[PDB]
Amino acid sequence: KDISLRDMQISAILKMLFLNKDLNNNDNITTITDDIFNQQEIIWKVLILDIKSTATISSVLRVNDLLKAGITVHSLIKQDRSPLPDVPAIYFVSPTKENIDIIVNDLKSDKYSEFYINFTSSLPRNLLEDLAQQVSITGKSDKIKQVYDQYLDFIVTEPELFSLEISNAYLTLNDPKTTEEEITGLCANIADGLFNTVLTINSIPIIRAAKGGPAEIIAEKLGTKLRDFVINTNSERGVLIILDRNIDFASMFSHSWIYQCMVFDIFKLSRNTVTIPLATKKYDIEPNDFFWMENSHLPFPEAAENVEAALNTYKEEAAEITRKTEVVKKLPELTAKKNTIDTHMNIFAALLSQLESKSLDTFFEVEQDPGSTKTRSRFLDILKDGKTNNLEDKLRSFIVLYLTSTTGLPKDFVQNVENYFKENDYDINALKYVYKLREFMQLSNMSLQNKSLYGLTEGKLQGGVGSLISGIKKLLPEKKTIPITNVVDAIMDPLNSSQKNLETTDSYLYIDPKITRGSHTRKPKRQSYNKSLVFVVGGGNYLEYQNLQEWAHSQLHNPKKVMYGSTAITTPAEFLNEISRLGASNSS
Amino acid sequence: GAMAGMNIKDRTSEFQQSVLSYKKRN
Numbered sequence A: 001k002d003i004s005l006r007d008m009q010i011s012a013i014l015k016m017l018f019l020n021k022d023l024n025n026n027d028n029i030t031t032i033t034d035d036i037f038n039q040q041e042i043i044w045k046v047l048i049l050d051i052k053s054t055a056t057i058s059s060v061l062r063v064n065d066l067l068k069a070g071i072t073v074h075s076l077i078k079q080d081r082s083p084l085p086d087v088p089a090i091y092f093v094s095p096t097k098e099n100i101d102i103i104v105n106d107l108k109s110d111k112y113s114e115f116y117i118n119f120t121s122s123l124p125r126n127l128l129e130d131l132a133q134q135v136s137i138t139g140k141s142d143k144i145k146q147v148y149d150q151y152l153d154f155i156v157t158e159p160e161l162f163s164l165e166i167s168n169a170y171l172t173l174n175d176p177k178t179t180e181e182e183i184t185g186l187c188a189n190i191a192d193g194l195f196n197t198v199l200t201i202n203s204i205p206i207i208r209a210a211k212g213g214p215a216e217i218i219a220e221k222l223g224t225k226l227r228d229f230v231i232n233t234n235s236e237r238g239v240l241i242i243l244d245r246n247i248d249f250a251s252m253f254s255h256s257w258i259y260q261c262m263v264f265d266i267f268k269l270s271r272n273t274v275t276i277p278l279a280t281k282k283y284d285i286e287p288n289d290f291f292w293m294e295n296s297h298l299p300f301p302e303a304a305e306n307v308e309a310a311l312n313t314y315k316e317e318a319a320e321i322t323r324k325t326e327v328v329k330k331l332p333e334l335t336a337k338k339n340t341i342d343t344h345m346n347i348f349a350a351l352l353s354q355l356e357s358k359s360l361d362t363f364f365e366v367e368q369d370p371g372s373t374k375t376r377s378r379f380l381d382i383l384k385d386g387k388t389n390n391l392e393d394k395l396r397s398f399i400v401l402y403l404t405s406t407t408g409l410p411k412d413f414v415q416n417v418e419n420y421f422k423e424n425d426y427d428i429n430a431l432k433y434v435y436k437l438r439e440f441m442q443l444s445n446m447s448l449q450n451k452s453l454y455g456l457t458e459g460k461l462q463g464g465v466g467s468l469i470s471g472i473k474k475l476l477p478e479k480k481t482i483p484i485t486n487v488v489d490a491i492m493d494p495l496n497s498s499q500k501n502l503e504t505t506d507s508y509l510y511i512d513p514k515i516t517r518g519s520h521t522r523k524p525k526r527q528s529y530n531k532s533l534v535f536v537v538g539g540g541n542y543l544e545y546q547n548l549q550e551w552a553h554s555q556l557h558n559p560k561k562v563m564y565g566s567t568a569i570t571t572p573a574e575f576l577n578e579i580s581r582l583g584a585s586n587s588s
Numbered sequence B: 001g002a003m004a005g006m007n008i009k010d011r012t013s014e015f016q017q018s019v020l021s022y023k024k025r026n
Helices: A005-017 A034-040 A051-057 A063-068 A097-109 A125-136 A169-174 A182-201 A214-231 A259-266 A300-324 A332-356 A361-366 A373-382 A391-404 A411-422 A430-447 A455-459 A469-474 A483-492 A499-505 A542-552 A572-585 B005-009 B012-025
Strands: A045-049 A071-076 A084-093 A112-119 A144-149 A161-163 A206-209 A239-244 A274-276 A281-283 A509-511 A531-537 A561-566
Touching: A005 A084, A005 A182, A045 A051, A051 A071, A051 A084, A063 A071, A071 A084, A084 A097, A097 A112, A097 A125, A125 A144, A125 B012, A144 B005, A144 B012, A169 A182, A169 A572, A182 A214, A182 A239, A182 A531, A182 A561, A206 A214, A214 A239, A214 A509, A214 A531, A239 A483, A259 A300, A259 A332, A259 A542, A274 A332, A281 A332, A300 A332, A300 A455, A300 A469, A332 A455, A361 A373, A361 A391, A373 A391, A373 A411, A391 A411, A391 A430, A391 A572, A430 A499, A430 A572, A483 A499, A483 A531, A483 A542, A542 A561
Parallel strands: A045 A071, A045 A084, A084 A112, A112 A144, A161 A561, A206 A239, A239 A531, A531 A561
Antiparallel strands: A206 A509, A274 A281
16 A cells, blocks of 8 residues: 555645645545545535646546546636636636636636635745735635645656656757756746655655756755755655756667557557547546556566456456446446456557557667667668658667667768668758767766566467567567666665666765755765655656666565656657757757 | 645635735725
């Protein structure tokens, strides 16, 4: 019974839908039993969200969960909302002049019997006074039962994956154009996002961050924020590791065999909403998706298998019940269960379709060797069997190679391969900037030490293959740790870490908000940690998330919880743009 | 932070006490 980051946000969100009940008193349960809900006897309320806040709720809660919490209706602050003078209202909206104004307008209008103002991040005195002044001249200040800064300004995608939804950060931060002001402002927001997360965790962590770039600024910014918070209170432990995306670009482009990553990669998977290919079917991977929370971290083959094991144990399970016996269905539990299966059932199917229709298992190998012509060839060799549904992956696997190379990479490829694109005409504005990032991928890979360790589908129920699962199962390489996992490893478990990883993270800015100045320095000290919050400033991936979890979920002798997150969870594709935009801008 | 967050989160009183000062002035 261990709580995930998402469970903690869902709990905070739920506590708010209960008029921030149970607050100011006792109780340690987590997801209210119904017999207790009947203890306070709850009444229906209106729930007003705004664009940004809806994105936060719809990520962790389903409509059924809302009703179950007493929410009758939910609508955006900006819509024309029909009055409900005798019903309570809970606003969960962004701290903006715009919204505040509307709360004041609805307050006057008498749209609802009461108001429970809940701000997404934190309302500034600036606006508190504003809202106050306006409300003062109303004879209704009495109807506002409570105003709360909820500090839930982030989205929790998977159980331990979070995003500040601050898109295009790597660009904004490294674009020469960008002001020395725009940068400070950006950092300040990221610092807030983190802070918002940290408070949700209810743990004041030790901040550790790579020096020199953004990550440091943000670290020192968040250090100061957390420091005051500890002060303005009175007058093991956790760690928060803040890294620069510069630590490992190869991973932003790489290819993977684990279920999530593929789905995230090949089927733009956002907000628990897979999008399978103008043609576009949409499957919802609703949190607590019986299968998904069981085969996400699993390699395509096992997953594909485990699906047919479930569709098999479903056909059985349903046969025993077939003996006794938005639409009220005869058996919801069963229908719902089969339907989750029906989802993955063809995600795998549509996946294979995508695998073969562009022979993907190739790129994956071209990147598992970064070395001699053994691999060198296999690449031009692959771009020799020309297509089009490879074009993107081509550029990617190339970049991976150019970056992980561990040795020059002949002026030949750069020319021959570069040609293959400028002739097939697929702007390579990116390969301009990419070549620079190589010196980074090389310095941290050298500074670290990697440790290791449709009917057709209903078809593959053998425990073996379908003549395609065979190749992928054999092509299962060394799921060795990645650069990020190394840095986290050395920080969370010092005693059992390579000297290289320890020494490299040893150079990481160390800061404790509970102390004041520190000493002459904030002389880095090694400690072990149970939980950690890991934030990459400039880009997040399922690839790194996947790694970090496998690493954490394999720690026997002092288990670890790792919460990963970035300014935005960017897609190999999307990140590939950000880069090229810098190659475009970094010349004119 | 440490169950001290509940403190930083609730701003009702702070608010009301402002509504109040704004009433006394206007």
